[PDB]
Amino acid sequence: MQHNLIAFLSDVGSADEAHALCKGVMYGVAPAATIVDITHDVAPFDVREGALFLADVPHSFPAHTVICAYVYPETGTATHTIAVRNEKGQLLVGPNNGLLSFALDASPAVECHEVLSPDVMNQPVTPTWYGKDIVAACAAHLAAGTDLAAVGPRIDPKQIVRLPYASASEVEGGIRGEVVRIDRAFGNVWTNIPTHLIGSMLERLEVKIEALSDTVLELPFCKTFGEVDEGQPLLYLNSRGRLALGLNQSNFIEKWPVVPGDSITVSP
Amino acid sequence: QHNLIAFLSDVGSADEAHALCKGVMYGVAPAATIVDITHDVAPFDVREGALFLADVPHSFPAHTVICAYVYPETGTATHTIAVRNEKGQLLVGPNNGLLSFALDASPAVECHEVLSPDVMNQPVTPTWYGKDIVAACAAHLAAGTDLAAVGPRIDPKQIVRLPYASASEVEGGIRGEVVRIDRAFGNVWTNIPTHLIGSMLQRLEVKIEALSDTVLELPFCKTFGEVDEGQPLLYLNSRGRLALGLNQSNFIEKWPVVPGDSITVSPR
Amino acid sequence: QHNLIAFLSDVGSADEAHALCKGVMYGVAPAATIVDITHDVAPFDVREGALFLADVPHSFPAHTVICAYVYPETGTATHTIAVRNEKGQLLVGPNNGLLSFALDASPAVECHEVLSPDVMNQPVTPTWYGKDIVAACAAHLAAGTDLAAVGPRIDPKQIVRLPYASASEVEGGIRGEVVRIDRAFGNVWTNIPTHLIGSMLQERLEVKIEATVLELPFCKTFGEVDEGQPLLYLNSRGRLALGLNQSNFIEKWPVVPGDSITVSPR
Ligand SMILES: Nc1ncnc2c1ncn2[C@@H]1O[C@H](CCl)[C@@H](O)[C@H]1O
Ligand SMILES: Nc1ncnc2c1ncn2[C@@H]1O[C@H](CCl)[C@@H](O)[C@H]1O
Numbered sequence: 001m002q003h004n005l006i007a008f009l010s011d012v013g014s015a016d017e018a019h020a021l022c023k024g025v026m027y028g029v030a031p032a033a034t035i036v037d038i039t040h041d042v043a044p045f046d047v048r049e050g051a052l053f054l055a056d057v058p059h060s061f062p063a064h065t066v067i068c069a070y071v072y073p074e075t076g077t078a079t080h081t082i083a084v085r086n087e088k089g090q091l092l093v094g095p096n097n098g099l100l101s102f103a104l105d106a107s108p109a110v111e112c113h114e115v116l117s118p119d120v121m122n123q124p125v126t127p128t129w130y131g132k133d134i135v136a137a138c139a140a141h142l143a144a145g146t147d148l149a150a151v152g153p154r155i156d157p158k159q160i161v162r163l164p165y166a167s168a169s170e171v172e173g174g175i176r177g178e179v180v181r182i183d184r185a186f187g188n189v190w191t192n193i194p195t196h197l198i199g200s201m202l203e204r205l206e207v208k209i210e211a212l213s214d215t216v217l218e219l220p221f222c223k224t225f226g227e228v229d230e231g232q233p234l235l236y237l238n239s240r241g242r243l244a245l246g247l248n249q250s251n252f253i254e255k256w257p258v259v260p261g262d263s264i265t266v267s268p
Numbered sequence: 269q270h271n272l273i274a275f276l277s278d279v280g281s282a283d284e285a286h287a288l289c290k291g292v293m294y295g296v297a298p299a300a301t302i303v304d305i306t307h308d309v310a311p312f313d314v315r316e317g318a319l320f321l322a323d324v325p326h327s328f329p330a331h332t333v334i335c336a337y338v339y340p341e342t343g344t345a346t347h348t349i350a351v352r353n354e355k356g357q358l359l360v361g362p363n364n365g366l367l368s369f370a371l372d373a374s375p376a377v378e379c380h381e382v383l384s385p386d387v388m389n390q391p392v393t394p395t396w397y398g399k400d401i402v403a404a405c406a407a408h409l410a411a412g413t414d415l416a417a418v419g420p421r422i423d424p425k426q427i428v429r430l431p432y433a434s435a436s437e438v439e440g441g442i443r444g445e446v447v448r449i450d451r452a453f454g455n456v457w458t459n460i461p462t463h464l465i466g467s468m469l470q471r472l473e474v475k476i477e478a479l480s481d482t483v484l485e486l487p488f489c490k491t492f493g494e495v496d497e498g499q500p501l502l503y504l505n506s507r508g509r510l511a512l513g514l515n516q517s518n519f520i521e522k523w524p525v526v527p528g529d530s531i532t533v534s535p536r
Numbered sequence: 537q538h539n540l541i542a543f544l545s546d547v548g549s550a551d552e553a554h555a556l557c558k559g560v561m562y563g564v565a566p567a568a569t570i571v572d573i574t575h576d577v578a579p580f581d582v583r584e585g586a587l588f589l590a591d592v593p594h595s596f597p598a599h600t601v602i603c604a605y606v607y608p609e610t611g612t613a614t615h616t617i618a619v620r621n622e623k624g625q626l627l628v629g630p631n632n633g634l635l636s637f638a639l640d641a642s643p644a645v646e647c648h649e650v651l652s653p654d655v656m657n658q659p660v661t662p663t664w665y666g667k668d669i670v671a672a673c674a675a676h677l678a679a680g681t682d683l684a685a686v687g688p689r690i691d692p693k694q695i696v697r698l699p700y701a702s703a704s705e706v707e708g709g710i711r712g713e714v715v716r717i718d719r720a721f722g723n724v725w726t727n728i729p730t731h732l733i734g735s736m737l738q739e740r741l742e743v744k745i746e747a748t749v750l751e752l753p754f755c756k757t758f759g760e761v762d763e764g765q766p767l768l769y770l771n772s773r774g775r776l777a778l779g780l781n782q783s784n785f786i787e788k789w790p791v792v793p794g795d796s797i798t799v800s801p802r
């Protein structure tokens with residue numbers, strides 16, 4: 001019920017003052033709040049990438065967090081901002097364009113409102129920056145003691161726009177999944193294949209990558225990077241419980257380029 | 269009370285330098301909240317830093333110390349100044365024009381040169397007045413040091429100011445220039461204000477003058493979503509000035525333009 | 537007490553990973569102030585991380601927990617350690633040399649291996665000891681957990697140390713090397729200390745660069761020469777440096793860490 005920590009994500013970058021003006025607005029409304037960036041380097045307009053970056057935020061952040069996020073190419077239109085309380089007791093504020101989808105998969109919506117009250121907005125609201133004047137402003141009002149019900153009208157959880165998320169499946173003689181995202185600092189590849197599907201099969205595994213070119217590798221299944229020699233490839237379960245590909249102390253995607261959506265098949 | 273420090277520089281955030289400044293500030297003012305504006309000002313680029321600070325006074329609350337340095341004159345006779353503005357904020361930075369546009373937004377009421385050793389981090393290193401004078405003095409002010417204790421009062425006329433172009437009426441339209449690029453998205457921002465373009469009462473001709481002329485016929489829109497994806501628009505930005513963009517694409521990647529380029533807007 | 541956490545890693549700040557670590561830390565130590573040092577250490581580059589931490593003890597106050605990981609050994613027998621230094625700061629990181637130069641600045645007084653499950657984020661994921669051991673333990677120390685509760689005491693000599701080259705006197709000058717590039721500006725930082733160049737000044741010096749001879753003025757600061765002109769100076773860390781006034785020295789004279797620099801009188 002206290003929410004003194006604001007965790008802030010956007011696609012505006014941190015190379016100029018724009019992300020910081022939003023923090024200025026938030027500190028003016030909630031001067032005692034702690035404000036921490038998640039990241040401002042979501043690719044421009046990339047709601048799905050934003051959604052992926054928020055997926056694990058509910059689990060890592062404590063109950064007293066307001067998750068404040070915008071990737072908002074619909075700014076100044078009928079696409080409203082929503083404010084949600086999740087099952088962990090956190091509050092989330094963002095555009096109703098699918099941005100909060102994967103965060104809500106981790107901790108479901110309990111109470112959901114559209115943000116329509118002028119008193120939780122930064123006035124006058126500029127049409128090209130709902131991110132500052134509605135999303136950041138409303139997050140700060142919630143951190144400063146405003147009740148969730150005062151932001152605007154209640155909506156049903158099914159009125160929250162959801163992005164589709166592919167599930168891995170069993171096929172003839174293995175598991176077909178896909179690349180969800182690249183761990184870009186390192187070049188590791190993250191799939192949607194969970195622990196339980198590869199249990200049957202665990203060793204040394206055939207991995208088929210369908211990208212610009214189709215590549216078959218025979219890879220050891222390891223707990224961590226150091227279990228093969230430097231520069232050598234491995235399969236492992238990542239910090240999110242999903243199958244991943246890497247090179248020990250090198251960059252897997254620089255050797256075998258792959259993009260999100262590319263098929264990965266794992267077979268004995 | 270000024271317990272919020274908003275911090276700008278050109279040292280980047282890719283190494284420890286900007287953080288050592290925060291270490292010095294926390295040692296002086298251990299209760300202060302410190303928030304970055306940005307550290308990605310182009311190296312030595314006082315004017316770009318000044319532009320990035322222009323809207324900081326408006327967005328940040330009255331209890332802010334704006335701490336900023338882009339200081340190629342470090343270790344020379346170019347002094348640091350501390351200013352109280354009409355909003356009641358404090359500003360600290362080199363007297364080299366860096367605070368010019370912030371002071372245009374909220375004028376100086378009181379100005380001092382920072383000369384007292386007791387508000388500096390001793391011994392002061394000649395190549396980093398940003399840490400040992402600007403950051404240190406901002407933190408002393410945040411810890412409750414009176415502005416008068418930093419050094420002698422100076423006339424606000426002795427604050428170095430940067431020139432800026434004004435838009436004006438010409439034969440059949442308004443001639444301004446490109447002030448900056450919204451680089452995360454590729455949007456173009458001009459100095460042409462709302463009040464001059466009273467003549468949306470009715471598509472407009474925009475003439476961009478560089479090494480070549482780019483003449484476009486553009487719709488005047490409230491926001492990005494009012495044209496199809498990839499299509500160009502003219503709009504009033506978050507600062508109340510004419511801007512150019514592509515809906516969910518990058519305007520300057522299609523039509524390169526740089527700051528200083530002339531822009532005329534006229535009836536078609 | 538240690539209510540300020542200063543946080544470094546190699547995971548970048550372009551995605552949520554560094555922020556999930558801060559979430560874990562705020563959950564353990566909700567009153568803590570958390571400030572990044574940087575997350576842009578080059579991947580797996582323990583030496584670059586160690587150099588970026590060198591000046592942190594001196595600039596940060598005694599109530600700081602220095603939380604740092606560059607941990608390609610995650611999920612192996614390479615343990616995390618927690619140290620109290622002579623300034624009274626706490627430091628947490630992998631025992632892989634990362635803390636070496638921070639400890640040169642302010643030596644270890646008490647050192648423990650981090651083995652207690654009660655200072656870790658459970659369950660500990662093998663590929664992210666940085667989050668589940670290093671960040672979690674830093675936050676428990678910031679919340680007032682005694683250092684002795686993290687795990688068993690070790691001798692200071694069991695802390696892995698990275699070698700660091702010393703400049704020396706040779707026939708008619710000083711032989712040092714490039715330690716790092718001040719990359720925002722292109723300035724070159726050497727391992728030559730203030731005291732070795734004091735001996736040598738009459739204020740013009742000759743520099744021989746690895747893989748060029750320059751005759752350079754020794755200046756207090758950049759603005760003592762015209763814009764675009766080269767200078768020698770003592771940097772903010774008390775070491776000899778090379779720069780161009782309002783330009784990029786390494787873009788004109790490329791030099792990499794480990795390249796020899798010899799300084800001799802005119
Ligand atoms: N040219 C453009 N087209 C569409 N949307 C744009 C834009 N420039 C910024 N934004 C969008 O403006 C939002 C602030 Cl509310 C950001 O999250 C960004 O997605
Ligand atoms: N090579 C160089 N020439 C002139 N100024 C320089 C420099 N390297 C860093 N600074 C300047 O040192 C300041 C710290 Cl006080 C920064 O703001 C930066 O502008």
Ligand SMILES: Nc1ncnc2c1ncn2[C@@H]1O[C@H](CCl)[C@@H](O)[C@H]1O
Nearest residue numbers: 186225249606607608610664665666
């Ligand atoms: N492909 C890879 N090889 C070796 N180590 C890797 C890696 N990807 C991430 N890390 C390492 O995982 C640590 C988190 Cl504990 C980071 O500090 C990073 O150094």
